[PDB]
Every structure is written in C-alpha cells, then in structure tokens.
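Please check this protein record:
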Amino acid sequence: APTAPSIDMYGSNNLQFSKIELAMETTSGYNDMVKYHELAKIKVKFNQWSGTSGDTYNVYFDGVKVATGAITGSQTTASFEYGQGGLYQMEIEACDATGCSKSAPVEITIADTDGSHLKPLTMNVDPNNKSYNTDPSIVMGTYFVEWGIYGRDYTVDNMPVDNLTHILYGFIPICGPNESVKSVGGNSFNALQTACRGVNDYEVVIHDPWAAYQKSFPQAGHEYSTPIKGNYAMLMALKQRNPDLKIIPSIGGWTLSDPFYDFVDKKNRDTFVASVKKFLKTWKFYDGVDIDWMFPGGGGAAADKGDPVNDGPAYIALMRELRVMLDELEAETGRTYELTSAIGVGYDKIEDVDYADAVQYMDYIFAMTYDFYGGWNNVPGHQTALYCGSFMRPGQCDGGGVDENGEPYKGPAYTADNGIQLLLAQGVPANKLVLGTAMYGRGWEGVTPDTLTDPNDPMTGTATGKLKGSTAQGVWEDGVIDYKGIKSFMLGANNTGINGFEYGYDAQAEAPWVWNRSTGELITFDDHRSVLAKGNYAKSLGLAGLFSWEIDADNGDILNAMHEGMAGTPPNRRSHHHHHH
C-alpha cells in the first residue's frame, strides 16, 4: 500500500468552496457582481512525500466516491465538480497494485444559496413576542424590508420567525423606467442605475447588494472568507432553522412599480418571467414570487401611467406565465413554489382586474387593507378599519349617498370589509384571500377641537398638515409612524394616553386612534383590539389568514394580536335571510 495522502490545506483554499461568486468590496451591475454555477469547481491538493505514491487517487465525500484520477509524482491536484451544497467528511485515498491507503477525514464546505452549508440562525427576538400554537395551515405573513438594517436597526435575527408562515422580502426592483424611485431619496435612483448596468430592461436585480449579501453580521458569524453575507445569508440560515417557513421576494411596491405598466407587451413579460426563473435558481432560499404592482389601471406613484383597458389582462397573463415558469422549477427541483400578489382594495383599484381569472394561477392574494386615509390630504379617517366609521356621511359606506357638495359618491367607502367583499363578489375564493394588518399609523397635525363637527370624534375634524416627528419616535417619513413608536410615545403601558395624547376607539369601524387636543395631532393605526377584530373576521369568513406591513415597526403587540385574533361561519342551510359572503 502507498503512503496515505496528506491534504494541503492552504493549496486547497482551506477546503472552502462556493457555487456562487459574489463581489464583496465593489459595487457594479448585478450580472457583474453575481455569478452562479450549477456545479462548484472543487480543487484539492494533497502530498505524498515519503514512501510510494501509487497509481490512482479516489476522493470521498461521506464515504461516497466523488472524484478519481491518476497519481503522478509526490504532488497531486484533484480538480473536479460537485453540484450539491453542504458539509462533507472528505477522505482522499491513494491506490496501487498492493492496495490503498486513506487520509484522515477532514470537513469540506460547499456553499449554496439554500444555506445547506450553514448552521441554523441564532435568533435575537424581542421577548414581548409571545409563543403560540396556531395551525400552520393558517397564513401569518409579514414584510421584512431590505433597508431596515440601517436606521431602523432591524435585522433578520430579530424576526419572530416561529410566529410567521410567510416572510415577504421588500423589494426587488425591475430594470427600466423607474422615475418614481427618485421620490425615495438616499441616492436610491443612482443605486438602481448602477445595478442595472449590464442588465436588460424588465429583468430583476438586487437594489442594495451591501444590505443583501455583502454586509458582515457578527450575530451570523460572518467573516472575510464568508462567500455569502448580508440579509440573504441570514435568510439562508433562517431556512435551516425553520425549513417550513416560506420566504418570498416581493417585486415592485409603491416606488418600484413603473416597469409593470410596460407589461402590456408580452415580450416584456417574457423577459421578466425568464429573469425571475434565473433569480430563483440563483437564490435557492426563496420559495416563489410576490408581485406588488401598484397598481394595474393607474393610481400609482407615476401619475401619467395606467391603462384600465389593458393592465388587468396583462396582470392575469403575467400570473398565468409566472405559474408556467414556476411549474418548470417544480419539475426540475421537486420543490413546491408559491405565486402571490399584494393588491389595492379600493373599489377603483379592484374593478381594473378580473381577479377570478388571475387567482386560478395564484396561491394567495395579500389584500392591502390599509392606507384608506392619510397625510396626503387634510381629511381625517380610519386608515385600516374593518368597517365604516362613525365619521362617514349617510350612504357613504355603500356609496349610494352624497358628499358635502351634493355630489354622489363614486363607489363604496375605503374599508377592509368593502374591499374583501368586492373581491369575494368577483368570485375570488375566501381561502386565497389574506387580510392586511397595519404595524404603522398615519397621521395629521392641527386637528384641533374647533374643527370637529362631532366634539368627541376627531375623525370629523380637519387637519392643517401631516404628522411630524423624529425617527426615535418611529417617524421615518412625515405622516407615517411605527406602531412601536405610537405605543412608546402616545399610548403608554395600558393605553391611558401619554404626552398630551388620548386614546379612542371606534367600535363601529373597529379602529383605534390617539389624539392630542392641544397640537391637533391625530394618528390612525391598528391596535390589539382592532387586530383581534380582524382575526375574528378572517376566521368567520374562512380567509387564508393575516399578513402585515412591516415587521420592524412592531414591538410584538400586533403579531401577538394577529395570533390571538385567529384563535378566538358554517355553510348556508336556509333561504329567508340576508345572503352575503
């Protein structure tokens, strides 16, 4: 028998290999920064200085032969390819006429984007998040935002993952027309231009590669030599901890929806769909795709865009085509992929799409049952209410009434129930609808008591402007505030109201508010009570479950209430009553 091979650690790259190459110290185009290989190139060097060397070498991973070849001299480099990520016990064997001798086992690491090479993520969750035994068939979704790792200081390990079934990652941009991005700030448009250099229009890219895969997180044990870092590596480790969790990339959103309006041309859909397939093959931890087109028919960030004739049909076609593509991935991998979308719930948004047609291809519709009222104007109202509030005029709820100027309402009022009922009215099944919960408030200032028609209901007042404040209090953009900020600075420990604010609740609407009479500051949000109501409502209607925007803004109260709401209606048996969904 020849001399047992001795592995040259330095010459074998310390046995660290990767199916993906990611630029860590530079920023350029997505295709320049990211290279994915179906087979990792393995290169291992071993030495046989003393004694004989032998004729043939064999390389084993956990006892299974993965490479073989001839031995020449005292030095042999074993170069081969391997397609499965993970950790393996590697042995190298040398053979001749007299027999074989094996090296001692040593661990080889082959990185892949499923996280197979990673240990389960260590969590650091706010203990205010309680423990629940909610049926795993019930959807409990939330959005994690890429940029939350900056000022918001909210990282993947902070997510109450055991209280979630779906994590939607916001947001994946589409290269092309993106003038709406300029409204964001922080040089975000420039970043997108850079990402899209070398990328064709209508293909997806990563907006912020630093946050996505470059940034070293010490809680995840990231190093210089770590082939994948950032949010993505942490999400990979999270999948190792929670294999049944669904992590889905969210494409678009409010300021990244511009390219969607060019999807009336099927060629652009084709380009997009192909890029998504490539994206899902490259980033294996993702379990499907979420489409947040805001909005088919118009009413989005770009005022000059929207086609009420063609957008809805295009949206439907997009879902059909994405489902075909996902079926291909399912055939190729044996995995199951989900197709979802977050949609507007105003009557004027819903009427622009035949969701009965679209939903046959989809797993879930995330109904954006929030942003009903807000700081964009000076009219108070419940931003995320289940039902029509006390402040509403006669016939406003159903839309058959008349406004202040004698002008008829053009459709039903913006409420969660009105939206859900319109979707059910189209023929969308309840069990594919997911009800939206707000982890944020919208707000005004200058709603002083003198402006109120009903002295005890600030929703009957008039504002002078948007809510202002500091990021310490959860105000990241004027008119919007983190739920945890509302709790810490307006509500206090038991909703007593602090710092000049008083707590109020509209039992008709199922909607809370805080109101400071002196400053006229008014905030509309979801609280424990309203979320309990939403949960009860979702269970009664047989909805798929609940989802939320955005997890970083919760202190645990909202997600807790989501679970407790789903904890606390039989088929129709008889006529002679109000038939209703």
The longest helix spans residues 311-333. DSSP finds twelve helices and 25 strands in the chain. The domain at 1-110 is CATH 2.60.40.10 (Immunoglobulin-like).
